[PDB]
Design a protein around this ligand. Structure first.
Ligand SMILES: CC(=O)N[C@H]1[C@H]([C@H](O)[C@H](O)CO)O[C@@](O)(C(=O)O)C[C@@H]1O
Ligand SMILES: *[C@@H]1O[C@H](CO)[C@@H](O)[C@H](O)[C@H]1NC(C)=O
Ligand SMILES: *[C@@H]1O[C@H](CO)[C@@H](O)[C@H](O)[C@H]1NC(C)=O
Ligand SMILES: *[C@@H]1O[C@H](CO)[C@@H](O)[C@H](O)[C@H]1NC(C)=O
Ligand SMILES: *[C@@H]1O[C@H](CO)[C@@H](O)[C@H](O)[C@H]1NC(C)=O
Ligand SMILES: *[C@@H]1O[C@H](CO)[C@@H](O)[C@H](O)[C@H]1NC(C)=O
Ligand SMILES: *[C@@H]1O[C@H](CO)[C@@H](O)[C@H](O)[C@H]1NC(C)=O
Lengths: 318, 174, 174, 318, 174, 318
């Protein structure tokens, strides 16, 4: 008469690593590294804004492609590839810092500047590179100041924006760089052109420079954009005589949101907290191997297909 | 293994026990039997559940992008960013690797130990009435029917009830 | 647990033993008694002491500020820094979490271990003169007065001195 | 007769975490994360300089608030909030890189440039924005060069500082941007104004730009500060005709020191190696949850209130 | 230690055994002998080997330079870099220290474990024919010659052959 | 009759650290931290290029020291201390970004710009600052344009490089900054001087500035170097009237390579994947305390001389 003690075994065991053995067979195990993502932007439960082909900088200056995105509120902001910032060609100084600022905001208010100009100034400068409603137009939030009488000198003028609010204001402006002397003279005259910008914490001067360059969207001219923050209760003064692309409205970045760059389609029916260029990640697992580039609340990226965690004893078959 | 039972003095596992992790096989005049021990099985399972719970708890750390997917990053800051991210990834895969290797070592050994604990409990139950096989069996020196076997598995075996008989059978004199 | 003694076959602890970590309770004709075992208690304490010393050893690494408290930080560099610091923080809170969980596991089990080791020491001392309770007690089959008890705790018990009397009592003969 | 083996227990145990159990009860436990800090700056054993309302940048240019901090030796430098850098309004290029360099030095020596100026130059230009002992003054280490005869053309002049030391020198200078044409003309004449600075390794040009702007400290004018390191044996040459705010002394950063930003009261009784905005952290514990921004030799910051490390066995009462 | 054998109930090690890690010393009529046990020694060595294999597995990850050795780095970015590199270095030093401390604790305990497992095996093999002295020796209550000792080391000792004589000598009755 | 169980020991045991013991004696131990570096650059198996005293940026502009390194293919690039980038003194904008970009390339091709000049222009200007065959020369990849007619105004000229390739090209150019008014007038005339550079992505303007400066390599004049990437299909246009140092060839960075900064001797008989200023590191160990500045595939740097991993049981001697 006898009684024996024992333990279970399975036909099909799983291999795991231990401190002393790279190939240990145990009765069961489970994955720790998430391998499966979602090819969609899961936006359920979030007030999101899909910018489409509007580039974030365009929201501030009013590029025609951004007309539906000049203002708004959101908790997540979605940027797509090849989005457009500039109808009339040019570039923004300190561009990435500005893009990032916008991409962590929870909305944008626009407040007018109140800038008025004398009759010798045509403040409705317009271009075929910025079409809007079938007509030549220009950046919604800016004004292309030009001499009313062609070839005549742009008058000496001064405009001051007063921030009479309780939060900082983002103001942007452009400097036009003509591609020819004729072009320069036609718009602003033969005089020496200078633009001076000054507040309590900012000062800078700009000089429009004529130069031959290839055409972008039909234009060999360039407009360079500049920006700063106007602190509450501070005034910022523009002193100019041509070449200033004047702001008609300034911006205010409201609250915080999550910035996503992705060309993945939106799904309003799934929810997520972790995003990447390729879409979304939903796991309880502490690790993932989909992307080293994620945003939100995400599992840590590791360079492994699989790390199995044992959930059973050694498997000892016979 | 650390505790000597599983893949140790126990020859192999029992595929035909889907009732639980640890258990008993007996032999008597009435023939054979098999039954899984619930207490030791839950003790092990509970510990594994504990690890799984720790694997799955999440930090609330929101991260933003520091690398534009669609525009150019300035070269120098870009190289610093690449170096940092890669350094961090190296740490996490190292951490991930070590967590699994360490946890699995421990998981295997605690499973070994729960088996030993069950064995040891049975050993002291029978005290002087049985002897050890060396293979995880106890040769019982008195008649143990199916009710007697049950009393052992259920922790109610009174050794004093059979001691007299068992002693005579172990000393081989009657 | 791992070794089956603490929270195992020992049903509970002794709140009344404020003298040490492990110890003895006895019962003879003179009555009862309690004494703490110094060696086993110290073996465990010195190991705890070791972990606390490792915990409290400091690294020499001095860091300077890379974030101004009083003046603005450029936005891009500021984002890089926040990303780097949060990533470093997550690593450290992971590590701290792991260290404690792992160390606690080992601490609990080594204390169980020292308890078991004391138990085993006594078992072999008594060899054929005592039998196991199953509850951490040994039933001694001879007259063990307060000096005999003391010699057991003090590791000077000579089993051959009592073996004849003990064996006859275990066999229940004269 | 029987002898029983056992272990101790306590009435009130502590809860700890293990790999397998979140609420394991043990006989004793000890904290691993420091939550308590001291609201003071423990300076015992360290030669420190409290800058009060002096801003580290002001040490280099000699703002009145920094008159007792133009030179010195320290191993710890303490900067306070709202510290003053500028008496006459302006801004420094690469201000943060400069502030950091200063805040990790172990002292500052000052050395005269020996610049002299001809009779047509008034080198004692003065302003009510920089009061000193009840009188209009200027930055102690700089000279505001102005035409001796009001309205006249500031003469073309050259000044060369020679580093004859064995260590590099930090030179700072300023560029004055007048608030009006009348003022610019009064100070430097009607001529075109240019400022060239050239060493062996550095070269740059500067042009004062007139521009309307708000009054800061009662002034709408501005001074822009620039700096470079002059290597030993190298010269640096200033070539100018108006608008140069010239160095009369040059700095040398000496050794190494720990910089702190905190408005916490100094305590010379206690010692510490770790500081943050809110004071000092003294612990043997490896982790803390006070702040992610610390300087010195500090416990690592973790996002947890408590992590108990067991110092006893499982608690089993009955 | 954890398993109570090495630096435990075994007084000390044998410098004269360069033959292996664990083994046997016997005393009989024909004198003394010493032989190492291969199977137990190799269980331990194989496990050290596994640890060394993990230590040495290489997971790079090419890194490029982010700090010029021969030219000046802009000061602010340089401080960020310094703070990042030192932070990562504190992390790796901490892990290197933890790895070694942790692995070493497990290494010595697993060695102690393999020693206990050999001991237990011998105990169960000899079952009722011998008694433990508490110092790691088995007093054998029957005549055991070289062929008999060699059978104990070989794991082929047949207890039923010597039991009668052995019980006779142990019990000193019948 | 008895049989005894035991374990081995040794006379001399090694000390290790455990979780509970700082001084535990075991039978054997092995090092985990590599302390031994190789004093050489182990280049076996790799197609390298030792630049010697040629600075990587000198490769693009063609400094005499870099004559043997104007083109080539490599998988590893070795830069040495004090390597020369400039013969005529000057500096390069965004220099570290450029250096790093060259140091991670796997080769360089040079493609002619095809720039041609009117007879009023001397394009073969030359200097004692750049010597070849013991005589006056210039940067191999640039041309110092100067009025053939001394004192006469440099003609207003336009030059356009068009990129007809499928890959981006690195174009560099210089701007001359003379050290005197006379030097200026002799080289380019008395006129106002401007250099305009424009592509579809890049535009900038440059003005030569006269300034007294210390002599470097015999010269107090300077040249500022500038660069961009010209994308495939794009043209870039230089409009200028004196002061442009024009590109005659343009660079194309090929593939990827490992950049090493070290003065260690080259060894072609040893292999390696880890390098630092002091040489190579060959180990199987996961850690090293040689240097926190390494490149390639390296063990992680640690702040310890030694961390011994036990490879045996406790040593219990007797
Ligand atoms: C160098 C000099 O002459 N300083 C004068 C300044 C400057 O003209 C303006 O501050 C420039 O903005 O103006 C004062 O009102 C001032 O600040 O006290 C009078 C003072 O005599
Ligand atoms: C801005 O302008 C208003 C009205 O001109 C004035 O009251 C206010 O003080 C100005 N703010 C500053 C900072 O100069
Ligand atoms: C950073 O890494 C990415 C991914 O490997 C690479 O494409 C990019 O070129 C790197 N940036 C720099 C500046 O080397
Ligand atoms: C960095 O993080 C802090 C909060 O910890 C935040 O206030 C700050 O704005 C962040 N910087 C940037 C550039 O977003
Ligand atoms: C600096 O000037 C002195 C004369 O004032 C001269 O001897 C020395 O060579 C100059 N140094 C340099 C680097 O030009
Ligand atoms: C970064 O650390 C190195 C090494 O200690 C040091 O030499 C260098 O000056 C540091 N950089 C800054 C900007 O402090
Ligand atoms: C470059 O120039 C060629 C000929 O001059 C022209 O055909 C081509 O369109 C130009 N490309 C751009 C991008 O301007």
């Amino acid at each position: 008469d006898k009684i024996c003690l024992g333990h279970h075994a399975v036909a099909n065991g799983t291999i795991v690593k231990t401190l002393t053995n790279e190939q240990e067979e145990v009765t069961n195990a489970t994955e720790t590294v998430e391998s499966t993502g979602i090819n969609r932007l899961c936006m359920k439960g979030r007030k999101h804004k899909d910018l489409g082909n509007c580039h974030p900088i365009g929201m501030l200056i009013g590029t025609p492609a951004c007309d539906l995105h000049l203002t708004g509120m959101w908790d997540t902001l979605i940027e797509r590839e090849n989005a457009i910032a500039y109808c009339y060609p040019g570039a923004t100084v300190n561009v990435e810092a500005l893009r990032q600022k916008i991409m962590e905001s929870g909305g944008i208010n626009k407040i007018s500047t109140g800038f008025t100009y004398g009759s010798s100034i045509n403040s409705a400068g317009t271009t075929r590179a910025c079409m809007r409603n079938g007509g030549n137009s220009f950046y919604a939030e800016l004004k292309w100041l030009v001499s009313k009488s062609k070839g005549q000198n742009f008058p000496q003028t001064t405009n001051t924006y007063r921030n009479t609010d309780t939060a900082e204001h983002l103001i942007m402006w452009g400097i036009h760089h003509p591609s020819s002397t004729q072009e320069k003279n036609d718009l602003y005259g033969t005089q020496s052109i200078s633009i001076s910008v000054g507040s309590s914490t900012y000062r800078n001067n700009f000089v429009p420079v004529v130069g031959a360059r290839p055409q972008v969207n039909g234009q060999s001219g360039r407009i360079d954009f500049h920006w700063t923050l106007v602190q509450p209760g501070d005034n910022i003064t523009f002193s100019h005589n041509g070449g200033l692309i004047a702001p008609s409205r300034v911006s205010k970045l409201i609250g915080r949101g999550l910035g996503i760059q992705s060309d993945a389609p939106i799904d309003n029916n799934c929810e997520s907290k972790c995003f990447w260029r390729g879409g979304s990640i939903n796991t309880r697992l502490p690790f993932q191997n989909l992307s080293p580039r994620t945003v939100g609340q995400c599992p840590k990226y590791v360079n492994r297909r699989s790390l199995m965690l044992a959930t059973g004893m050694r498997n000892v078959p016979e | 293994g650390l505790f000597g039972a599983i893949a140790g003095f126990l020859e192999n596992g029992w595929e035909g026990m889907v009732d639980g992790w640890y258990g008993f096989r007996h032999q008597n005049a009435q023939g054979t039997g098999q039954a899984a021990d619930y207490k030791s099985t839950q003790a092990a399972i509970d510990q594994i559940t504990g690890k799984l719970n720790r694997l799955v708890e999440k930090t609330n750390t929101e991260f933003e992008s520091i690398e534009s997917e669609f525009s150019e990053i300035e070269h120098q800051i870009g190289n610093v960013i690449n170096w940092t991210k890669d350094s961090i990834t190296d740490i996490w895969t190292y951490q991930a690797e070590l967590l699994v290797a360490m946890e699995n070592q421990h998981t295997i050994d605690m499973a070994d130990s729960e088996m030993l604990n069950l064995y040891e409990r049975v050993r002291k139950q029978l005290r002087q009435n049985a002897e050890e096989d060396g293979k995880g069996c106890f040769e019982i020196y008195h008649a143990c029917d199916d009710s007697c076997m049950e009393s052992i598995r259920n922790n109610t075996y009174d050794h004093s009830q059979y001691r007299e008989e068992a002693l005579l059978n172990r000393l081989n004199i009657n």
